[PDB]
């Protein structure tokens, strides 16, 4: 589980979104496994605005923050998980690392802020849904 709280936005994995999230929907994209909802309270998270490919992500299944190198956001085939069929996912970044389904929503950060959230796993890779292109999270 996990979310990004930037301004009056909450960013979650679309597959983990709640009824409240859907009742307060701003934007969602199945192909990216992202959903953004509106919040009453101001969040304090900063979204990274950069092309960094090194960062640190939180892995709940190991209670560990792992430094990782990660790929550029791309359209990648993802094998079946417990929450999606085998399919293409867009704006996805891969690293070598541990990811179980319960690790979805772990934050990946660099010196510039939040890069993305864990969205995929298996075959010894961890996949992160990028958020750095969503410049509208910074305003309004």
- Catalytic residue status for 15: yes
Binding mask 12-41 for Zn ion (x = CB under 5 A): ------------------------------
Residue with tokens 């101001």: 42
Residue 119 CA, chain-centre distance (Å), reads 6
CA distance 115 to 136: 15
Q: Judged by CB under 5 A, which of 8, 46, 52, 56 binds Zn ion? A: 52
Q: Judged by CB under 5 A, which of 25, 50, 75, 80 binds Zn ion? A: 50
* Contact status, residue 76 vs residue 94, Cβ threshold 8 Å: yes
Three-class SS of residue 61? helix
Binding mask 97-126 for Zn ion (x = CB under 5 A): -------------x-x--------------
Shortest distance in whole angstroms from residue 86 CB to Zn ion: 31
Give kind and range of the element (H or E) at residue 89: strand 87-96
Give whichever of 24 and 71 is closer to Zn ion, judged by the CB atom: 71
21, 33, 45, 130: which is the annotated catalytic residue? Answer: 33
- Catalytic residue status for 33: yes
45, 59, 104, 130: which is the annotated catalytic residue? Answer: 104
Those residues with Cβ within 8 angstroms of residue 56's Cβ, 6 or more apart along the chain or in another chain: 65, 66, 67, 68, 108, 109, 110
Shortest distance in whole angstroms from residue 101 CB to Zn ion: 27
């Amino acid at each position: 589980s996990g979310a990004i709280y930037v301004g009056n936005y909450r960013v979650v994995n679309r597959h983990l979104a709640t009824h409240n999230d859907w009742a307060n929907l701003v934007w969602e994209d199945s192909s990216r496994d992202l959903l953004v909802s509106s919040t009453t309270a101001q969040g304090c998270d900063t979204i990274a605005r950069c092309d960094c490919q090194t960062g640190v992500y939180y892995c709940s299944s190991r209670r560990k923050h792992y430094p990782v190198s990660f790929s550029k956001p791309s359209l990648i085939f993802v094998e079946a998980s417990e929450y999606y069929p085998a399919r293409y996912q867009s704006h996805l970044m891969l690293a070598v690392g541990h990811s179980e389904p319960g690790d979805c929503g772990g934050i990946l950060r660099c010196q510039h802020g939040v890069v993305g959230i864990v969205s995929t796993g298996g075959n010894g890779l961890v996949g992160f849904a990028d958020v750095r292109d969503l410049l509208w999270l910074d305003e309004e």
